[PDB]
Structure formats: structure tokens, C-alpha cells
């Protein structure tokens, strides 16, 4: 079991029928909270049981309450890659720019785990592409760091900035270079990522790059500035 409240365990376990009989037998169970300040909605979202989520939504339960970790149903759904559930939540007005305890919005996780469709759904629904977490990290930082090249492209289409700096002074380009995401890096400079911004270590994306990647980028940049 994952919860101290029976209804929450049934939601995670996906027991739709028993869950419905018990909620209709006592409507309060639909919003009862557990030790993590979670309701059947959170757990159903985590497990990805679309059916249970739809049943709960048509029941009119709240869709924006956060658990004790600051996670809302949308954060969970997005990070867990439950495309269907994320679309349904958005319809019911899920807050697309809500942040959890570390300052992240659903888009952060979607971009991080390279979830294209969920990312698009979120951006089309008004997510701020430049949303910064408590460490001033954006969705693009997490994508660029891991080499999520297509994700970066998606973020760009929605006017994402390429030069926002995190608490260590790094821009998505920095991260890309540090982790040697070669193709990503060239692409970034190609779209205006600055090769001149210094991080807290006084290094530029050029001085962070390895294997002569810096020469390449400097050439791309200078040519893109000409």
C-alpha cells in the first residue's frame, strides 16, 4: 500500500469499481486527505489510471490542491507522463504555472523527462516557457543538460529564452557544453544562445566546452552575428 487512507490506495491500485462504490457510498472520501495531503486524485494521477481521474473530475472534486510537497495533480501527471490525464486536467482548469516546493512547474518535469506531447499540451495551455525554479533553472536548462535536443526545439517555438542564468550562473548553453551535448550546443548558439555570458565560475560557455567544441561554437556565433 502507498497510503494510510483506503480510498487513496484504491486509486493508486486502479480499483475503479470499488473506488466508485465507496465514494458514492460516502462522497467525502472523494476529497479525503492522507498523510501526504494527497487525495484519490493525486494517487490516480501518479499511477496513471485515467478512468479513475475522469470519474473524480466529473464528480467536481478540486483539481489544483497540492500535496505536502507542493505537487499538484498536473505536476504529478506531467512528470509521470500521463498524456491523457494531463489533457483532461487542463480542460478542468488545472493551473499550468503552479509551482511545487522547489519552484518547479509541470513544464519543468515534462521537459526534463523529454515528454514532447505533454510539453506541447502545457505550452498550448499557457505555460510560461521561462518559468524559473528556486535555483533559477528553467525547463530548457533541464532539457539542454540531458541532451533533449527536440525538447529544446519545442521550447524555442514557444518563445523560450536561451540566456536565463541559474544560481550558479549557468545558461542552458553552459549545461549543454559541460555535458558535451554537441549537437544541442551548436543548435543553441544557432538560435541566439550567447557565448559571452559568464557563470559564477567566471567561465563562458566557451571555457566550459571540451574537445575543441568552443572553436566550433565561436565560429557559429560570430557568423550568426555577422
Amino acid at each position: 500500500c502507498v497510503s494510510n487512507i483506503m480510498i487513496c490506495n484504491l486509486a493508486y491500485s486502479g480499483k475503479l469499481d470499488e473506488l466508485k462504490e465507496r465514494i458514492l457510498a460516502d462522497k467525502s472520501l472523494a476529497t479525503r486527505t492522507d498523510q501526504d495531503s494527497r487525495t484519490a486524485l493525486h494517487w490516480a494521477c501518479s499511477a496513471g489510471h485515467t478512468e479513475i481521474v475522469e470519474f473524480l473530475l466529473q464528480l467536481g472534486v478540486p483539481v489544483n490542491d497540492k500535496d505536502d510537497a507542493g505537487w499538484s495533480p498536473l505536476h504529478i501527471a506531467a512528470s509521470a507522463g500521463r498524456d491523457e490525464i494531463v489533457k483532461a486536467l487542463l480542460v478542468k482548469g488545472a493551473h499550468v504555472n503552479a509551482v511545487n516546493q522547489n519552484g518547479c512547474t509541470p513544464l519543468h518535469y515534462a521537459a526534463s523527462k523529454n515528454r514532447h506531447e505533454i510539453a506541447v499540451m502545457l505550452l498550448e495551455g499557457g505555460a510560461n516557457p521561462d518559468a524559473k525554479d528556486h535555483y533559477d533553472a528553467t525547463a530548457m536548462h533541464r532539457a539542454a543538460a540531458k541532451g533533449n535536443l527536440k525538447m529544446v526545439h519545442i521550447l524555442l517555438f514557444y518563445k523560450a529564452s536561451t540566456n536565463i542564468q541559474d544560481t550558479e550562473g549557468n545558461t542552458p548553453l553552459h549545461l549543454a557544453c559541460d555535458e558535451e551535448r554537441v549537437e544541442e550546443a551548436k543548435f543553441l548558439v544557432t538560435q541566439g544562445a550567447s557565448i559571452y555570458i559568464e557563470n559564477k565560475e567566471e567561465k563562458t560557455p566557451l571555457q566550459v566546452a571540451k574537445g575543441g567544441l568552443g572553436l566550433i561554437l565561436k565560429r557559429l556565433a560570430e557568423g550568426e552575428e555577422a
Partner: protein, 73 residues
């Protein structure tokens, strides 16, 4: 340490743990604190502990958050 190595240790150690699907280790990987493999090891162990102390067989984001705070000063 190197950013990729930091990620590797996290994913290596948790590969043998039951993490809820919404958890994203990149949340801790991406932080500025200079921790060591031992710290990473402690963070994961405490997280498992925190999950058990709640009779939960799946590890949550809240577990890693406390654990992180508990190990890094």
C-alpha cells in the same frame, strides 16, 4: 563532481529502489551544492527510510527533499 557522474550515482543507486513515477532526480542533480558520492548514498538511504517510516513502499519527492535537506547541513 562532474554533473554526469552525479546523475549516474543517483540513477545507479535508485535503480534498485521503488520510486513513484513522478519523482525526477534531475531536481537534485541540478543543484549547486557540492555533495559527495557518500552524501548521494546517504540521501537515497534516508529517502528509503522516510518512505518506510510512513509504511509506504514507493519513494516520493517529499522523501528526497527532506533527505537532501538532512544530509546537506
Amino acid at each position: 563532481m562532474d554533473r554526469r557522474q552525479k546523475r549516474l550515482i543517483f540513477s545507479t543507486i535508485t535503480s534498485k529502489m521503488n520510486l513513484s513515477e513522478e519523482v525526477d532526480l534531475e531536481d537534485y542533480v541540478a543543484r549547486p551544492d557540492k555533495i559527495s558520492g557518500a552524501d548521494i548514498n546517504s540521501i537515497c538511504q534516508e529517502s528509503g527510510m522516510l518512505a518506510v517510516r510512513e509504511n509506504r513502499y514507493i519513494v516520493l519527492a517529499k522523501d528526497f527533499e527532506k533527505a537532501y535537506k538532512t544530509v546537506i547541513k
